[PDB]
């Protein structure tokens, strides 16, 4: 009940989660806005919200166009609230030499909520910093999928060398908050192929402790 959609030159994975009523939740629309918008329209899906795992430039480049086209709210953790509009904070200037920004701040700011309901989609919310200070992971129990951004990938873990990066915090997020989830849970991460909690527990070389 979701699609992984790599977008932009970085090929960061956006996700569209949907239901049988053709309503949808968008995660991390990072680039190539027109490819994402036209796909949603071809599929006759009605998006309800944009949920951001974090505000690095490669996850936000299509936010303006998607937000404007569909008149939907943007959710982001308060610790990164300044990052959307500031290219000196979100990595674009430093990592690519060009500024990437939104034109408006997020209209919903997350803090310590453990649950979030978007229409009839309910998520458990975990604050999972280490790759970035406002990184959050959205667990959708109904279809056993975790939209965890750049914390945990297939065969690797998030880089901890960017603004506010902290490897000691990232490993705690992984061991204490992500890996206790059910082993069949799909890890729908920001970069690379899908995986599951169980597969990474057994085979991710950065997770032998
Ligand atoms: Zn990132
Ligand atoms: Zn990323």
Author numbering: 1 to 209
Provide passages from the article that reported this PDB entry.
Previously, BLEG-1 (formerly termed Bleg1_2437 and Bleg1_2478) from Bacillus lehensis G1 was identified as a member of the metallo-hydrolase-like MBL-fold superfamily which exhibited enzymatic activity and predicted structural characteristics similar to the B3 subclass metallo-β-lactamase (MBL) antibiotics-degrading enzyme (E.C. 3.5.2.6). MBLs degrade β-lactam antibiotics by breaking the four-membered β-lactam ring, destructing their core structure and deactivating the antibacterial properties, thus conferring antimicrobial resistance to bacteria. On the other hand, GLXII (E.C. 3.1.2.6) is one of the key enzymes in the glyoxalase system involved in the detoxification of methylglyoxal, a cytotoxic product of glycolysis and other metabolic activities by converting S-D-lactoylglutathione (SLG) to produce non-toxic D-lactate in the presence of glutathione (GSH).
The crystal structure of BLEG-1 solved at 1.44 Å resolution unveiled structural features which may have contributed to its promiscuity and evolutionary divergence. Diffraction of BLEG-1 single protein crystal showed that it has a space group of P41212 with one molecule in each asymmetric unit, completeness of 98% and Rmerge of 0.045. Solved 3D structure of BLEG-1 showed a global topology of an αβ/βα sandwich fold, with the active binuclear center located at the interface of N and C-terminal domain. At the binuclear center, both zinc ions are coordinated via trigonal bipyramidal geometry in which Zn1 is coordinated by His-54, His-56, and His-131 residues, while Zn2 is coordinated by Asp-58, His-59, and His-191 residues. The zinc ions are separated by a distance of 3.3 Å and are bridged by Asp-150 residue and a water molecule, Wat1. Another water molecule, Wat2, is interacting with Zn2 at the apical or axial position. Analyses on the global structure of BLEG-1, L1 B3 MBL, YcbL and GloB GLXIIs revealed that the enzyme showed higher resemblance to GLXII, particularly to YcbL, a GLXII-2. Yet, the active site architecture of BLEG-1 resembled that of L1 B3 MBL, which allowed the accommodation of β-lactam other than SLG. The insertion of active-site loop in the N-terminal domain of BLEG-1 active site formed a configuration similar to B3 MBL binding cavity which eventually allowed the accommodation of β-lactams. We propose that BLEG-1 could possibly have evolved from GLXII and adopted MBL activity through this insertion.
